[PDB]
Symmetry: D2
């Protein structure tokens, strides 16, 4: 209970929101039309406490693609169904670059961690093995529905189509992983890439995503349904890797000044988690050099300076 009075806190969220609104820097991702379309002025913040209390300000009901934000979510699912040991048999846990700047794999021929494309691609191949992509996709959709307490969870076919058609780097990664036997026996690599592109194209709203974050903040229990969605083990692992590998190269600076588990996405979203307190989703298309939403980064630094949510405060 670091939030004795929700109303007053809500009032502070609005002030912070308003302050970050003045930050107009950054560039909206434009490698595909579906991302370039977005207005640089879209800005929204949704909060969902461990209690189930809600608060939204700004453009919180405009759908956008999770993109990389889906990474910790599918990682959580894999750990939930397969266990920590099995999953990390295929992907690493190291947050460092190590001496592996832009390398698809580490010295042991394993993706560095679940938060980079190579890792997410490997994780994607571990979920619900043995069924067609249609079934795998439905499986994860149901899962995301539970995390969001049945709130908005859609799909962008146009993003999926464009992401796949222009994802040369991901295909390069897919073939290299095949070279090094990084997938489980009998994996259809190209088929896995399709599933990966689809997952990146799943849509949410600031409001529904915040519930997803709140579930991770509530030990794996959806705050608005009470249902156990993810195992404690899955949640703890996800938060650890989000804390260390979730904000691209800004992770170091982010962990030092913000000290919270988070995962950004090229659509401008930032899934934020305040363990045992609340889940949050900040969204604003304009990204900085590192690929993180400018307004989002600003907002997070401000949230911690004001409410002292840093893990080591």
């Amino acid at each position: 209970s670091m939030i004795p009075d929700f109303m007053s806190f809500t009032s502070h969220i609005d002030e912070l929101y308003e302050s970050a609104k003045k930050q107009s820097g950054g560039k909206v991702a434009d490698y595909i039309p579906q991302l370039a379309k977005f207005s640089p002025d879209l800005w929204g913040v949704s909060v969902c406490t461990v209690d189930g209390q809600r608060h939204s300000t700004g453009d919180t009901k405009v759908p956008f693609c999770l993109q990389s934000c889906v990474k910790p979510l599918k990682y959580a699912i894999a750990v939930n169904d397969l266990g920590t040991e099995y999953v990390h048999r295929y992907v690493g846990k190291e947050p460092s670059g190590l001496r592996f700047n832009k390398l698809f794999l580490n010295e042991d021929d394993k993706p560095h961690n679940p938060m980079v494309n190579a890792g997410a691609i490997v994780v994607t191949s571990l979920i619900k093995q043995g069924v067609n992509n249609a079934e795998k996709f439905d499986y994860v959709m149901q899962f995301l529905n539970k995390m969001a307490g049945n709130e908005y969870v859609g799909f962008s076919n146009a993003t999926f189509q464009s992401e796949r058609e222009s994802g040369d780097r991901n295909f390069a990664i897919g073939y290299y992983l095949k070279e090094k036997k990084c997938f489980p026996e009998g994996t259809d690599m190209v088929g896995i890439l399709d599933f990966y592109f689809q997952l990146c194209s799943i849509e949410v709203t600031c409001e529904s995503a915040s519930v997803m974050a709140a579930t991770l903040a509530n030990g794996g229990f959806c705050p608005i349904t009470g249902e156990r969605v993810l195992s404690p083990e899955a949640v703890r692992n996800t938060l650890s890797l989000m804390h260390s590998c979730g904000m691209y190269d800004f992770s170091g600076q982010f962990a030092f000044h913000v000290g919270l588990p988070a995962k950004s996405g090229v659509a401008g979203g930032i899934l934020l988690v305040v363990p045992n307190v609340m889940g949050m989703m900040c969204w604003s298309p304009p990204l900085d050099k590192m690929g993180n939403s400018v307004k989002g980064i600003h907002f997070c630094h401000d949230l911690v300076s004001l409410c002292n949510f840093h893990n080591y405060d």
Copy 2:
């Protein structure tokens, strides 16, 4: 209050201690005689809660050198006296290797972080500038006394003499930093290295060190004196960097499975901090390939599995 009953908890510390005692692997550091001397069977664990409650088991009153364990301590001192902004003008905050495996500096010509020699060396040059080494040394000694609530804090002249005489790598680092203008204007580099070697040679006991850790766990207040020793800012920064850069290359695996701020030393010590709960010091000379005490690493993994102290539990 995650420790409702101190006595019962104490009983669990003994069981864990006993279990790690069976782990006889590792090699006692032997690059200098002062470290080689130590018996591989020395093993002790001291606990000091935020309350001021104490508990020790094993060889908790045998002096040993902090060595790298002193790094977060002098970093805390620098931040306390100079502030976050000034200090990081000279040293980085990145926990990753990045693509800088064994490099003395990063692309901006700054040590990666305060937890590696190059960084500690730079930090050492920022403390109490303008006075002779004798005065700087006394200054830090008084400081460590306050952190330990006036408990055991000694000095090993033999270690200092040997460390300096055989520290070629540190001298190489010292000259490279001089090359790149990494020190404050007018710094006597060789004189700074002496101070650095001296600090690494400061002695403590598991019992006194645990109080130091408890001070960091108590927001900067010594649990057994009530005195404010370090600013909140200094404590938070220290814990962040300990969490990410304190266990050498094992940091990644350590953060994932243990999730606690810690700093190891070549003497076999591991300064452990459980934020808002307790401070700890585990000591056992035999080190693993990574340079961390074998019994210590084992003990830490066990402590978290049993008492659920992981930051994301």
Copy 3:
């Protein structure tokens, strides 16, 4: 005229051949059946002087695939038809690893040199642009025929089929180059990879290949037909890059002790050139850790110690 008496020299080639024959180390490449099939005892050496004088010893009429040996040949063709400036607009000239160990591209997003797969793949895309692969292939075949003075130049469909079906790393490279716009406008990357696999599957004999080498040693004139096949510019460039990037990581040790332009291949072949004197082809399936024929490497070191052919002798 460093070979006043061809007969006596021929006698020395036989002694060297015989001496290398005792070197039974190495492993026959076995990533595909077409390479694993080969007997580790196959060993042949063919010489073709700038005069047109010939000499063969051992298994000099057994067909084998050029594999990487074709790299300097297609590079020569590209330079011959397009010129030095145009070609190096797409591929580098640096022989070093630089700090790019196993990276597909350098900092300027260009393959390091024509002698590594990424470079050969790019070079392949520059030759005879605008026609179907059938026409490109015939074009290069005619070219290789001229270099060999119409001697044996075949094709292994089985090798081509296997190389393509198991070439995941090359496909990874193909997609990454597409990512970075490394190909000429309108290139069909997958179609280029097919052409690349085909070229690697071209067959020769020690005898025909030696004529090809002799052509490079004769300023671009086929020693046994007198026809100008390659421009002087093309020949000089090819020899420079062969000297520095032709023997995989052994290039450094090879340039120092042998000092001759050469290109090895996974089939066990080593295209050797002694500028203004002769061309040679050594073949022996067993490769060393670096991927070079064991008997071949031995033979080359011996040839230089005996006849003083080192470029700086």
Copy 4:
């Protein structure tokens, strides 16, 4: 005899000299006053054939420090007295960066090659072991006198004093090599650095240096005295490593377009060798980004385009 008529050739050297004279780019090295002093307009070229025929144009009698130009010379001396095998027990032969950009040592803890500071420093420690620096210095001076056929060979005490006083990077290298046991048993590292600084401070003129180059071009025989100065083995090794590691990072581009053994120096000198034809020394203080004399680089590219001296022409 690629120079049938020396007079006409001499006439071409003047035209090339004149053409490079128009190249006013570059920056005169200024890390120490002794180098900053030099006028950016100083420009001279001296030629000394294997015959003993001479030709100079420009500022060919103005003393300047060999600096890095002395590297292949002391390497030659070491090989001459100790043999190839012994010397490379301490230093590598690899020309590549490998993945060792700015690293003092390679994976085997050996300097990459004799042409970089770490290597030159190691080589310096192998020459005339067991005598004081005064004796070592005299020993090398006599040696350089023989290479220059007793022509100008001086010493800059001011450069030596400044180089040593500001050579922090070299001291960093010196301590790191000591860390890794890179020197022969019982080496006085600091004493070796003094000797190294002294050697870099040896002075020559374009005219005397060209004779030194001619000696290397004449298989180790001083063209103007007939005396055997260096063993054939020493000369061949020196030329190989000059060809691949003598022009700093420009080596790759230099080997491709110029194809001649060369070694540059921060004073603006470029020791050039045309095997079996002539030795040359180009000097012009203004250096390019890579650290090579601008006029010198231009002149070399021109010399090869006109007279076809490229090793593979």
